[PDB]
Design a protein around this ligand. Structure first.
Ligand code: HEM
Ligand code: HEM
Ligand SMILES: CNCCCc1cc(C#N)cc(CCc2cc(C)cc(N)n2)c1
Ligand SMILES: CNCCCc1cc(C#N)cc(CCc2cc(C)cc(N)n2)c1
Ligand SMILES: C[C@H](O)[C@H](O)[C@H]1CNc2nc(N)[nH]c(=O)c2N1
Ligand SMILES: C[C@H](O)[C@H](O)[C@H]1CNc2nc(N)[nH]c(=O)c2N1
Ligand SMILES: [Zn+2]
Lengths: 407, 411
């Protein structure tokens, strides 16, 4: 019931007690592990509110205080009366920071306590959402010196007045299915792009067209907005050695900003809560550029390097992979846009894990997501046993709004 | 019940029904996943249903389920269990059992080959000298002058737990590791403890960087005995690089035969504590883990220097760059010496086809993603994008404690 995690490189053993507080379910059973699966009322609400307020008041060293009991009292009254309740600013900030702290798939959690929280609960229309999002983007981007941020729109009431950002990220590139049968742009975004087109977006059918925001306020139909081009910081990708690399015409945006997740705090659900940090290099260079179902540029790069692509055993893919990732890091650094390499990021995470075990009794982590998509075993996280479990406050997946939306 | 696994690269969805036949525990609960945890005397009572479950599987597999032959065999095993408290497998059942333990090994990416396994029945073995002879024959057969052949040799099963056969080596072929008084290590740091045991048992160590360890063999619960594998039977490959000529002067080599000797084979409730098995290497086992783990030979630095990479900041990806070149060299060297080896691209592509085939013909393929995905270039192999379900089927290979921690010394 007390669990040990071992690092097989350093032999350091940590003891986890935090998992006992866990409450949501994993998908795993005693007979089957689903560790590699990507997506495995008033009476319901008060114990959730209670659980949360208890941890909040414990965190500020005021557990069992009158202010604690009083707050629990007031929230109780408000749920009985109004069927929901409103978080104090302090609770909202604590909860958002802890949702990130609890994100078992996130390798960048050493930064968790330095999150800028923008309270957008006063927002009522899609134009207001656009304004808050532009401000978030400008704040977070900070001319290349990225700062973590989350913007939190009004919580779910009856599920019929949902605030939703329809985009999966604030900034992404369009994808178009061609008559040539190939894909132009980002293949990941074909369906969403068509939805943008059905709703009136005039697409410029290019390879790197920044998608417009599709914003839904108060359960109303979603409206389109273009993010001011001057607020989307992008980086042309060049290589420090290969002068031909620039000719590939590659670029990427500086700000990774997830906008389709649900933030749960004290049983309250924030269905629109875009959040952003800064990239780890492999996200762009390995996944975005080299995934077969993404930009898939391995072959083109390999050819320009004049590698032997006859046999897999020449490891031409691996060679081209490293160089593409070299170019990404070099390009961001050269343009002074915050980025972290997978070595630095994973080393940071090991330190964070040890900090969390020491000061919290554990750290939920999903090894399948934490180990980077290249060079896994030369990073310290590969050798690190991790326990995965779900704590609240949490970021959760939610269904795409177009499958949900009653137009 | 049905479980679906999706491939996120191809959107191919597979349906698992085989997990219903799962018996053993995973370590996970509905509250916690232990998927990344490395390591998460039997009564007649528990033994007959385990025997019966196995014999039902065997007889189904040969299309003789419910036959008089099946029924007679159940009766025979039942009577042998009540008479003698255990039972003996027929050779046919042993072979089926060993092949299925491999087929069921969720951590093994090489399972496309499972039906081609040479099984050596060593259940008539009684002494450590006999074990040595069987193991030499296995090594020679499996090596086949570099045209590697998968094999397993099966020594007598556990009886009371006081007469175990055990190979004390973790693998049949491994290099010694010696801790120096200055804290540095000569040879393979993985093998320092075992090397010290061998030395204490009387092994005269050459104390070099690549000394093949002697076999330490325990028969019938007796104290283990030291044997040196005939050097002419140990195929080794000097490592060189196709473009870089200085690579050879690193002085690296490795042996050709990966042969795990510390696991326990469970078939029909019977426990084979000594069952060395061998296949051929996937390049990254040597080039990534053996050479580049900080806790093994750890050569990334020396290599990186010789390539004149920028080692001042990790952001240059010098480690990744050197890692690739080392793995090129390993594959190049084995191929040039005509020693069987498979690259991680080939191996994972084959595994995907095997897995898809298993879903169709068997209703599933238990697989441990954490172990299946190679230790370099993960997401440019197809297994990275493949959802997998991990569960435990029998017959199976299991971990067992290291013999030096449990052995009762006779002196
Ligand atoms: C500040 C620097 C940050 C770094 C370097 C970082 C790194 C990463 C990486 C590499 C992933 C894997 C993403 C993927 O493979 O798709 C990830 C996932 C995730 N991150 Fe972080 N992150 C950062 C900031 C944040 C912030 C500010 C939050 C929330 C406030 C956050 C919450 C999450 C969540 C919930 C996931 C899982 C997403 C999913 O399941 O799709 N991260 N992070
Ligand atoms: C024929 C070519 C084979 C290849 C290419 C192959 C490949 C691999 C690899 C790369 C691993 C991971 C090892 C590690 O990272 O430590 C592994 C594990 C394993 N293999 Fe295979 N293998 C082969 C044959 C076999 C055979 C013949 C058997 C048994 C009859 C077998 C049973 C296992 C088992 C039980 C494991 C898990 C070992 C552990 O948990 O430490 N393999 N295999
Ligand atoms: C099923 N997975 C689908 C992909 C989700 C996703 C895609 C991209 C891209 N491109 C980028 C991200 C961003 C993830 C992220 C988020 C944050 C906050 C920081 C950081 N470094 N990375 C997510
Ligand atoms: C906790 N893990 C410790 C290492 C286990 C192990 C180490 C080495 C080495 N060196 C080599 C192996 C061989 C594994 C293997 C076995 C077989 C049969 C084929 C194949 N390609 N690989 C295992
Ligand atoms: C099927 C498998 O779970 C899937 O490919 C996962 C593997 N690990 C990952 N890890 C991260 N960080 N991001 C991902 O999208 C994935 N995809
Ligand atoms: C902690 C983690 O489970 C451990 O480092 C695992 C990761 N995946 C692995 N995969 C293989 N094939 N072999 C290993 O030894 C490991 N080690
Ligand atoms: Zn699990």
């Amino acid at each position: 019931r007390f669990l040990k995690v071992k690092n097989w490189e350093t032999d350091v053993v940590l003891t986890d007690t935090l998992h006992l507080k866990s409450t949501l379910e994993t998908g795993c059973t005693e007979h089957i592990c689903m560790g590699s699966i990507m997506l495995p009322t008033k009476d319901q609400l008060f114990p959730l509110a209670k659980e949360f307020l208890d941890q909040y008041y414990s965190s500020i060293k005021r557990f069992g205080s009158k202010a604690h009991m009083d707050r629990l009292e007031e929230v109780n009254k408000e749920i009985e009366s109004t069927s929901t309740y409103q978080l104090k600013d302090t609770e909202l900030i604590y909860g958002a920071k802890h949702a990130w702290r609890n994100a078992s798939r996130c390798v960048g959690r050493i930064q968790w306590s330095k999150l800028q929280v923008f309270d957008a609960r006063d927002c009522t229309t899609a134009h207001g959402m656009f304004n808050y999002i532009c401000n978030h983007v400008k704040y977070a981007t900070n001319k290349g010196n990225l700062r973590s941020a989350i913007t939190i729109f009004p919580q779910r009431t009856d599920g019929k007045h949902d605030f939703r950002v329809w985009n999966s990220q604030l900034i992404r590139y369009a994808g178009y299915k061609q008559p040539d049968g190939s894909t132009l742009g980002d293949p990941a975004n074909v369906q969403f792009t068509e939805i943008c087109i059905q709703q009136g977006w005039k697409a410029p059918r290019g390879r790197f067209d920044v998608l417009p925001l599709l914003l839904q306020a108060n359960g109303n139909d979603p409206e389109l907005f273009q993010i001011p081009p001057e607020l989307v910081l992008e980086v042309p990708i060049r290589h420090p050695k290969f002068d031909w690399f620039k000719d590939l015409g590659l670029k990427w945006y500086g700000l990774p900003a997830v906008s389709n997740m649900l933030l749960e705090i004290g049983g309250l659900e924030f269905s629109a809560c875009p959040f952003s940090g800064w990239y780890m290099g492999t996200e762009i260079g390995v996944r975005d550029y080299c995934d077969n179902s993404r930009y898939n540029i391995l072959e083109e790069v390999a050819k320009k390097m004049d590698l032997d692509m006859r046999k897999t055993s020449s490891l031409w893919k691996d060679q081209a992979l490293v160089e593409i990732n070299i170019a990404v890091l070099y390009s961001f650094q050269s343009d002074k846009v915050t980025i972290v390499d997978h070595h630095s990021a994973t080393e940071s995470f090991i330190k964070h894990m040890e900090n969390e075990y020491r000061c919290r009794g554990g750290c939920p982590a999903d090894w399948v997501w934490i180990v980077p998509p290249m060079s896994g075993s030369i990073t310290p996280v590969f050798h690190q046993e991790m326990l995965n479990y779900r704590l609240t406050p949490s970021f959760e997946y939610q269904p795409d709004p177009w499958n949900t939306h009653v137009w």
